[PDB]
Amino acid sequence: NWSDEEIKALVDEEKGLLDPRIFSDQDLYEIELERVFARSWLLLGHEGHIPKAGDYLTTYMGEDPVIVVRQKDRSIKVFLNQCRHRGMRIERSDFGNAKSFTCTYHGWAYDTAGNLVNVPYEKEAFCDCGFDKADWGPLQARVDTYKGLIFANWDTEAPDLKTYLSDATPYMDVMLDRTEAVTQVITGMQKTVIPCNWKFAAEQFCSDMYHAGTMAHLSGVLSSLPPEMDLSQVKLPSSGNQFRAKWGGHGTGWFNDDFALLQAIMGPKVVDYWTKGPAAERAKERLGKVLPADRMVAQHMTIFPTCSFLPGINTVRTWHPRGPNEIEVWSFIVVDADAPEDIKEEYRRKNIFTFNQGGTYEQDDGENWVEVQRGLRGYKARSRPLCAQMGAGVPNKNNPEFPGKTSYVYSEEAARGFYHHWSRMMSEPSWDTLKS
């Protein structure tokens, strides 16, 4: 099978070369579940998904189903949605409020913390004791949040969430920390299946503004523009930058100053709320302390490995892996809690129209990934590296005004960082070296 050396060689961070096999190899996928998904901080949802004690949500961490539930002390617990007796799914509903969880196979019952509290006929069948319910509760995951977003990680040796986020938080704040009131999540999570590798999706949201700046969304722009306006009336701004996290593979890109571009997508109502008035001013006050967030347009971002969102548009989603050739997209919409109700409604409708499966933008996104995955069946198609050198080693593309390593809006520096960190998690057994 695969040696760490061979794995590390699959990605050339310097020249910017990607071995196509990382997107199709089944063995590498199994390794990803172990070395990537089982030890990364993964997006599970938003605090607004489980506001009250007992409220729960069933989702995934890689391909492991998990239950996310609010505790009475307001903390959040996340554990494997699998009964240790014979492996039955403990909770089969999508969400709700519970006082307990029961496995219907043999009746093993659990409390909202995931403790096995009742085993039918325990004294008659397990004793005459050598059996202790305390030893058989489903695996617990570490849980933390970052301004509304809930993350989980199974690895007790991994760095805490904040540390993990490296120097990428200021960029996340653009969407999550605009007000002291926090963000709310619109009710309703959309789940869809796409036959492609998770890396294509996560990478795109991490470093690929290029597809949007070229041909991928010409039809999407036409759909979101006013009927009297056409493409010739839209100048794609020449000025934007991209950020690569110091550590972790996170990334984000954006255009500078020209909000007409964001307005071409979200409309004037959303853009004005985002750029003019008390709300916008309040945001500049908070965000300006770390970066010139007020000039960022149509920002795209990915928190390694599968947490992606678009500040300004406000769609958020987790890419759940389903083997090397498939994923599930679980998306939701966030809005400022104190935003005017008509602004929240506008964000809801614009999101459904654009970045929801069925939207005028999202559908063209999957179109490329799907075609790429199909082609990887070919032997020659997997025999030569993909070109990820855009801007590699090219000077004078950074913008010191923004914190961290930056480059031009059309660049693959962030992508290079994305795949490089991937290669590291995949080839480094211990956090002793990985956390560095």
């Binding site: 089969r92 509903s93 999508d94 969400f95 709700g96 619109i186 009710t187 309703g188 999570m189 959309q190 789940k191 869809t192 299946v193 796409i194 036959p195 041909m215 991928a216 010409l218 039809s219 999407g220 036409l222 759909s223 979101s224 009927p227 599930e328 939701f332 919409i333 409604e345 809801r348 409708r349 999101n351 459904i352 129209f353 929801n356 499966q357 069925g358 005028t360 559908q363 063209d364 999957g366 179109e367 490329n368 799907v370 075609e371």
Partner: protein, 182 residues
């Protein structure tokens, strides 16, 4: 209440009305299957509310929680102009996901009509199976029910869709995407 059927009469409407509605739907289907989206758009009223809610999994007792309520996220929640805008993109020759275009078939059956208190206004239930084949071998099947509010008119195809609520029989979308209208 989407968890209960429309209040159809025990005694069905007239033969004439039943046939007109079915024939209208079959023609609508033809417009979608031959990509005449503009003619299709013309069948919707300016007040149309084209909605396809997200459906979730719960125990039967908790079935009231199945549908994400109005005002929440959804697969589709459109107006006449948003549909018009989607159509603009579809026929632009730049909507890669549908260009090359899919080969679709909009089968319609189980048409049940309910006459409302307003003359000329009907509430209709119908099952649909939208088959979609694209590229070389991509194939998807979309099955569900459509609940419409139709207005009988004297011109066009005889009816206009004033409201459509699509109950797609899926929780997670299993198809490759939702590029088809239902």
């Amino acid at each position: 209440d989407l968890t209960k059927p429309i209040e159809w009469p025990e005694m069905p409407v007239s033969l004439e009305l039943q046939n007109a509605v079915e024939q209208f739907y079959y023609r609508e289907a033809q417009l979608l299957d031959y990509q005449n989206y503009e003619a299709w758009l013309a069948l919707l009223t300016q007040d149309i509310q084209y909605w396809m809610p997200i459906r979730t999994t719960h125990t039967s007792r908790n079935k009231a929680m199945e549908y994400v309520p109005p005002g929440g996220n959804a697969h589709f929640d459109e107006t006449y102009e948003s549909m018009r805008a989607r159509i603009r993109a579809r026929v632009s020759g730049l909507n890669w996901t549908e260009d090359p275009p899919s080969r679709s078939r909009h089968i319609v059956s189980n048409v049940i009509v309910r006459e409302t208190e307003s003359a000329g206004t009907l509430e209709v239930s119908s099952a649909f199976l939208c088959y979609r084949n694209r590229l070389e071998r991509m194939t998807d099947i979309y099955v569900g029910e459509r609940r419409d509010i139709l207005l009988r008119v004297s011109d066009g195809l005889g009816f206009k869709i004033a409201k459509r609520t699509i109950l797609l029989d899926q929780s997670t979308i299993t198809a490759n995407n939702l590029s088809q209208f239902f």
